[PDB]
Amino acid sequence: QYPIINFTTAGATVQSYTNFIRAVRGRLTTGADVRHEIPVLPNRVGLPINQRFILVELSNHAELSVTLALDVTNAYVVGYRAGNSAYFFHPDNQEDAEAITHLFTDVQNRYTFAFGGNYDRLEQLAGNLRENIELGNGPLEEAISALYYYSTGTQLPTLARSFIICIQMISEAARFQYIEGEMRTRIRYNRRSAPDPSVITLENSWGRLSTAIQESNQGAFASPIQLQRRNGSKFSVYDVSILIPIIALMVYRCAPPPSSQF
Amino acid sequence: QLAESGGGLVQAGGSLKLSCAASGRDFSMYMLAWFRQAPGKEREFVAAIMCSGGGGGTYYADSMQGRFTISRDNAKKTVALQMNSLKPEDTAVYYCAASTTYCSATTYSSDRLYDFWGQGTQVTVSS
């Protein structure tokens, strides 16, 4: 089977959440592929299916639990399994579709949504932008419940909001220690609050950065990447040097050229 | 909004064809199915087709399998039901069903999974 990472919200602390995200990261990459100090995720083309996913099992304030499946090539969530059923976002190509059929194989019920995991559809399904969807311990606990009772009937809107919560707190937290940081702070000071423009813009640009960083001149971007501060103030990124404490993982965009010695 | 057309009248053992034309960009991601009600019987699952990204497998009920065939034209946003060697049992009103929530499901046969329904069209088989 696939590697499994566990985490409970009930007694979750800053140490528990940090241990959780630090372990998820360690499963996503060897890695053993590092460029400008940032680890790269394995290349999708030719990834053997036995190495293609990781499993994240989430426990509620009640014992009820849900197991999430994350695509190793981009750390994104591809679907989940409530105990008796398995749900999957609509893949965008055949090879992807084939790959998920190796997930939760012993389950009895097997569904594939008529939509993908991209934030736009999830936002229209939830009725709210992630800008307007609180995150933190409370929201995650609350989310991982509606993900169980969906197989038993909690309509789509409330379900979509739960994905939005989980993806940011897990998929994005692994991608960005900055996003991991903000989650860690919401737990330390025990607050629930939506993400600010720095988190949202970081999410939107994780692929744009992965291209820039891997296609940079010794870390110099061929063109600047626009981001936003916590106050919504825009600013341009010209160099890998400043993202090193911000981003933790990149999607493989190309082979690593020979190093420029001397 | 499912627009169903093409019933008809046929001497037993012949052929007809029903078509359903949808209007929606995400049409390619829909689980699609046909249901029929024969008078005296309740509404009955007939056939289903999975979205391309959901395997795309086609499924039929045993009493209709072989004789019938379901297909979609994603470019034309149309579904088809080609019926061959029609028995008089096959005289019924037929419906299209589309799942906007679902691409593929082990429980496809359930009418509960489908959100949109074409207007029933009459198939008559004489002998």
Domain span at A229: 175-262
Token digits of residue A189:
């000071």
Distance CA B64, CA A107 (A): 29
Q: Give the residue from chain B lying closest to A87, CA to CA.
A: B105
Question: For residue A38, how many C-alpha atoms fall within 13 Å in the half-sphere facing its CB?
Answer: 29
Indicate whether A68 and A142 sit together in one domain.
yes
Q: Last residue of a domain, which of A174, A204, A239?
A: A174
Token digits of residue A139:
């929201």
Residues 6+ apart with CB under 8 A from A112: A87, A88, A89, A90, A100, B50, B51, B53, B54, B55, B102, B103, B104, B105
Which of A138, A5, A6, A4 lies closest to A61, judged by CA?
A138
B11 strand-pairing partners: B126
CA–centroid distance for A73 within its chain: 11
A80 in Cβ contact with A70 (< 8 Å): no
Q: What residue has token string 């991209």?
A: A118
Distance CA B76, CA B94 (A): 21
CB atoms within 10 A of CB A189: 10
B93 strand-pairing partners: B37, B122
Q: Provide DSSP, chain A.
A: ---EEEEESTT--HHHHHHHHHHHHHHH-----EETTEEBPPPSTT--GGGSEEEEEEE-SSS-EEEEEEETTT--EEEEEETTEEEE---SSHHHHHHHTTSSTT-SEEEEESS-S-HHHHHHHHTS-GGGS-BSHHHHHHHHHHTTTTTT---HHHHHHHHHHHIIIIIIHHHBHHHHHHHHHHHHTT--BPPPHHHHHHHHHHHHHHHHHHTSBTTEEEEEEEEE-TTS-EEEEEEGGGTTTTB--B---SPPPPP---
B75-107: string of b/e by CB count within 10 Å (b at 16+)?
eebbbbbebeebeeebbbbbbbbbbbbbbbbee
Chain B residues whose C-beta sits inside 8 Å of any chain A C-beta: 26, 29-31, 50-51, 53-55, 99-107
Which of B65, B108, B56, B57 lies closest to B83, judged by CA?
B65
Residues 6+ apart with CB under 8 A from A83: A65, A148
Distance CA B108, CA A41 (A): 36
Question: Using only C-alpha atoms, what is the Rg of chain A?
Answer: 18
Q: What residue has token string 């744009």?
A: A208
Which residues of A are the active-site residues?
76, 119, 172, 175
Q: What residue has token string 């995400």?
A: B26
Which of B45, B62, B47 lies closest to B110, judged by CA?
B45
A215 strand-pairing partners: none
Indicate whether A108 and A49 sit together in one domain.
yes
Interstrand relation of B68-73 and B78-83 (parallel, antiparallel or unpaired)? antiparallel
CB atoms within 10 A of CB A31: 14
Which approach determined this entry?
Answer: X-ray
Resolution of the structure, angstroms: 2.6
Distance CA A251, CA B65 (A): 46
Indicate whether A157 and A190 sit together in one domain.
no
Which of A74, A38, A36, A81 lies closest to A53, judged by CA?
A74
Question: What residue type is A226 in one-letter code?
Answer: Q
Give SS3 for B36: strand
Q: Select from B25, B50, B104, B116 the residue whose CB has the most chain A CBs within 10 Å, as the one to mutate to test that interface.
A: B104
Q: Nearest 5°: phi and psi at A188? A: -55, -45
Indicate whether A6 and A121 sit together in one domain.
yes
Tell me the nearest-neighbour CA distance from B101 into chain A, angstroms.
5
Q: What residue has token string 């001397």?
A: A262
Of B100, B101, B106, the CB nearest to A110: B106
Q: Last residue of a domain, which of A117, A150, A174?
A: A174
Token digits of residue A203:
């999410």
Indicate whether A145 and A189 sit together in one domain.
no
A63-76: string of b/e by CB count within 10 Å (b at 16+)?
eebbbbbbbbbbbb
Give SS3 for B24: coil
Indicate whether A8 and A94 sit together in one domain.
yes
Indicate whether A141 and A258 sit together in one domain.
no
Token digits of residue A154:
């909690």
**Contacts with B33 from chain A: Cβ below 8 Å:** none
Indicate whether A121 and A199 sit together in one domain.
no
Token digits of residue B8:
């008809």
Q: Last residue of a domain, which of A174, A203, A231?
A: A174
Give the DSSP H/E element, type plus range, for residue B108. none
**Contacts with B51 from chain A: Cβ below 8 Å:** 90, 112, 114
B104 in Cβ contact with B51 (< 8 Å): yes
Question: What residue type is B27 in one-letter code?
Answer: F
